Ligand SMILES: *C(=O)CCCCCCCCCCCCC
């Protein structure tokens with residue numbers, strides 16, 4: 001499964 | 009961590025250092041015929057996505073129970089037309105759309121998928137499968153359903169003569185063949201700060217908007233959407249460009265058409281046709297919005313494959329940002345794999361939350377840096 005990333 | 013499930017699987021453990029190249033266990037001469045036992049009250053099902061209602065059940069399950077970011081704000085908002093693109097490439101099987109249903113309700117509460125793919129890993133080409141969309145209803149996650157879904161799809165893949173697989177995860181499992189990191193390029197910085205996808209860095213809203221402003225049109229000559237006549241040369245440019253990486257797909261011209269032929273709100277592909285009429289480069293990015301949990305949607309473009317032979321990759325990705333900006337996206341996402349580290353920082357991408365771990369099932373080989381991964385999954 002793909003991971004949902006967000007600007008750190 | 010202790011890995012109760014993966015210690016029973018043909019994968020090397022985390023501390024292990026691999027210097028060999030080959031399978032962990034041999035191909036199976038006889039495969040178990042009956043499906044694995046689900047807990048009482050649930051039964052298997054093969055999902056025929058040709059049924060609009062069955063496909064409706066799937067994305068309702070995914071868009072309510074699938075992966076979210078580390079902070080519980082954004083859930084992938086998968087489209088019915090998107091799932092058909094990702095789960096019906098050349099060679100797909102309905103039995104490989106492995107679903108779990110409540111026996112009495114017939115409600116869909118679990119799913120896992122497998123699509124075939126030719127994988128080139130280092131010096132070997134193998135017929136593998138790509139696993140994706142492992143999703144368990146949040147009410148069900150207490151009954152150990154996920155390991156059963158893995159063993160069942162593994163059994164159904166073995167029945168077709170395939171014994172290797174590639175898959176990704178945001179969590180570290182035994183044992184990652186490669187670790188990539190997500191980067192984000194703000195295209196609409198006003199909204200990203202509104203819904204807290206990003207934070208104001210001291211910079212006013214005016215300074216941030218000026219820094220991310222993009223030209224109205226791309227700069228590269230001969231840039232145009234891909235069409236039918238470009239399918240062979242796109243297939244040709246992709247095969248040659250991938251030979252430099254260590255983990256790549258080996259696509260037929262039929263598969264190149266499926267993954268790259270443009271579809272509105274699914275996949276976008278622009279080719280570069282020069283003054284002599286030759287296609288020398290192409291960029292691509294797919295569409296995957298995210299559900300905003302509170303106060304409705306986040307349009308996100310994801311970098312796909314970007315091949316260059318006459319245009320600099322930096323110029324090509326600048327056009328991708330301009331194009332995605334034109335089409336209405338709010339953020340342009342890209343991993344640090346392939347040659348992406350040559351433009352991420354220059355084109356004002358920002359490093360992201362967490363990683364994307366790449367995995368090979370039943371294949372022992374050394375790890376590689378992210379720059380050597382040439383594989384992008386949906
Ligand atoms: C994201 O959804 C990846 C899901 C991780 C499950 C691992 C699957 C392992 C391989 C299953 C079938 C392999 C049969 C050759």
Ligand SMILES: [Cl-]
Nearest residue numbers: 025026374375
């Ligand atoms: Cl290694």
